Every structure is written in structure tokens, then in C-alpha cells.
Amino acid sequence: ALVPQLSTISRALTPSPVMVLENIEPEIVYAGYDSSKPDTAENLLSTLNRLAGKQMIQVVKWAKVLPGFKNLPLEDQITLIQYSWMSLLSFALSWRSYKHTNSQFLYFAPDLVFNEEKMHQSAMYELCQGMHQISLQFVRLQLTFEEYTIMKVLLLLSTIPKDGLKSQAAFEEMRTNYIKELRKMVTKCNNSGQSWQRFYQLTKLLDSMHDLVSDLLEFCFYTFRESHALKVEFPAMLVEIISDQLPKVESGNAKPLYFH
Ligand SMILES: CC(=O)[C@H]1CC[C@H]2[C@@H]3CCC4=CC(=O)CC[C@]4(C)[C@H]3CC[C@]12C
């Protein structure tokens, strides 16, 4: 007589959150690097900024379909993306470096791979070495794609306003759920000692991104404010993001969340 509103088939066929993360992972983006131009800081940095703007367009499309993110107030979704963008892009850079070059180079894009020489020419050498160190860590830990996709969501949820989000409870719920995903993901089959040791390594890695990202942002805000004198160009997307972030971070309104 009445139509069952529950779908057994639907629940059974719905993919796990981890499988969804794999399904929504953005496709690789090209930098549009032109080797006919000289490899001076002005050109390399402008090209990386253009690449960043293209990558952020895809990050936003990804965030729209990230399981759980839609549950947070809109204002909070926008805020987390703005506070975490540098952590997401630098972590993804190490991932590509790890997968495409065994962490021997920094794989910004298929058409723009930095070797030591480009790192020096970029005038961002020490920062490049810092992102490279994360890539090297991926090799030591043999980071898996599943672990990486969960950690990336955790990074999106790693920095919040000192004040607070519109819904701290909604945020905590999502953050706790994804930490649970990582927790289960590192569970072996049966060996708590090894399982906790790896969870510790992964969370220590996540934590280490805050100091790296702070240094990346210091340099970013610096080149941004002196873009005219330095001739470093930024695409509309980055001007929007940085114009919002710079004052908030510099006034002490960004609060990093740590595991340790
Ligand atoms: C121009 C500048 O200040 C540099 C310093 C840190 C650099 C960013 C470092 C992380 C990064 C990784 C990418 O894969 C795309 C470009 C970005 C997002 C870089 C764009 C250029 C930045 C913002």
C-alpha cells in the first residue's frame, strides 16, 4: 500500500567516504610555463601564481562535493578554504612530487618541474627545500593515496578564526569524522602498536605543515604587497584570497589546530 521511503539498494551501493575522495580528486592542472622566457624570479613566481589560481578553481569545485562539507554554514566553508589554501596546495605539490618523481624534484605541474636550479632562480629556495622535505617524508613513510586524501581534508580543517566559526559544533563533527577515517585507515590486520605508531607519524606530519605554511605565507604576503616593485603578478583568484587572508593572519586572527 505505502511506498517505502528507505532505499536498501541505495544504502548498499553508496561508496565509502574514502572512495568518494578518490572520485572527486581534481585532475592535474598545467602551469602554462613558457621556456622561451628567462628563468628570473619575476617570471617563475608569476607563473607559479597563475598555476595557483588555476589550482584553486579546482579546489573549490572539489570542496563543493566533499562529504560533510555542505553540512557546515556557508560562511564557514568559505572561511576554511581561505585559511587553508596554502596548506592544501603545498601538500598536493609534495604528493605530485612523490608520485611523479619519487620526490627527486618539485612537480608543480607536468610542464613545470623544479630541479635545484629553478629552486634557486625562483628566489624561494629555502621554502622550496621545505616543501621538498615533506615530499621526502612521503617516501620514508610510503604514504598511500587513501591516507593522502584524508590528510588533505584534515588540512582544509586545520586553521580556524581565533574568534570562532559560525558553528563550532558542525566543524568539530566533520573534523572528528575525518580523524576517525584516518584512524581506521591506519588499522592493520591486529597490531595496535604499529597502528598507533603510524597514526602518530601522520599526525606529526600534518602538524609540521603549520610551520611550513606560516613561512610560505610570510613570503607570499611579502611579494603580494610589493608586487609592483618586484614585478610579481597575481591572478584575480589569488588577489581575492590573499586580500582576505593577509590582514586576518597578520593581525593574529588565524588559529592553527594541532594534534601534538
Ligand atoms: C609568489 C609567492 O609568494 C610564492 C611563495 C609560496 C608559493 C606557493 C607555494 C605552494 C604552491 C604549490 C603549487 O603547486 C602551486 C603554486 C603554489 C601555491 C606557490 C605559488 C607561488 C607562492 C605563493
Swiss-Prot record:
Function: Receptor for both mineralocorticoids (MC) such as aldosterone and glucocorticoids (GC) such as corticosterone or cortisol. Binds to mineralocorticoid response elements (MRE) and transactivates target genes. The effect of MC is to increase ion and water transport and thus raise extracellular fluid volume and blood pressure and lower potassium levels.
Variant or mutagenesis effect after changing residue 230 to A: Reduces transcription transactivation
Record annotation: effect of changing residue 46 to Q: Strong decrease of transcription transactivation
Region annotated Important for coactivator binding, chain positions: 61-64
Result for mutant: residue 257 to P: In PHA1A; loss of aldosterone binding and transcription transactivation
Compartments where located: Cytoplasm; Nucleus; Endoplasmic reticulum membrane
Outcome of swapping residue 49 to A/D/H/Q/S/T: Abolishes aldosterone binding and transcription transactivation
Disease with which this protein is associated in UniProt: Pseudohypoaldosteronism 1, autosomal dominant: A salt wasting disease resulting from target organ unresponsiveness to mineralocorticoids. PHA1A is a mild form characterized by target organ defects confined to kidney. Patients may present with neonatal renal salt wasting with hyperkalaemic acidosis despite high aldosterone levels. These patients improve with age and usually become asymptomatic without treatment. Early-onset hypertension with severe exacerbation in pregnancy: Inheritance is autosomal dominant. The disease is characterized by the onset of severe hypertension before the age of 20, and by suppression of aldosterone secretion.
Tissue specificity of this protein: Ubiquitous. Highly expressed in distal tubules, convoluted tubules and cortical collecting duct in kidney, and in sweat glands. Detected at lower levels in cardiomyocytes, in epidermis and in colon enterocytes.
Name of the molecule in the record: Mineralocorticoid receptor
Membership in a protein family: Belongs to the nuclear hormone receptor family. NR3 subfamily.
Assembly information from the UniProt record: Heteromultimeric cytoplasmic complex with HSP90, HSP70, and FKBP4, in the absence of ligand. After ligand binding, it translocates to the nucleus and binds to DNA as a homodimer and as a heterodimer with NR3C1. May interact with HSD11B2 in the absence of ligand. Binds the coactivators NCOA1, NCOA2, TIF1 and NRIP1.
Binding site residues for aldosterone: 49, 55, 96, 223
Amino-acid positions noted as binding 21-hydroxyprogesterone in the UniProt annotation, renumbered to this chain: 49, 55, 96, 223
Effect of residue 234 to A: Abolishes aldosterone binding and transcription transactivation
Species in which this protein is naturally found: Homo sapiens (Human)
Effect noted on mutating residue 61 to E: Decreased coactivator binding
Binding site for progesterone: 49, 55, 96, 223
Post-translation changes: Phosphorylated.
NR LBD domain boundaries: 5-242
Record annotation: effect of changing residue 46 to N: Loss of transcription transactivation
Domain notes from UniProt: Composed of three domains: a modulating N-terminal domain, a DNA-binding domain and a C-terminal ligand-binding domain.
TM stretches of this protein: none
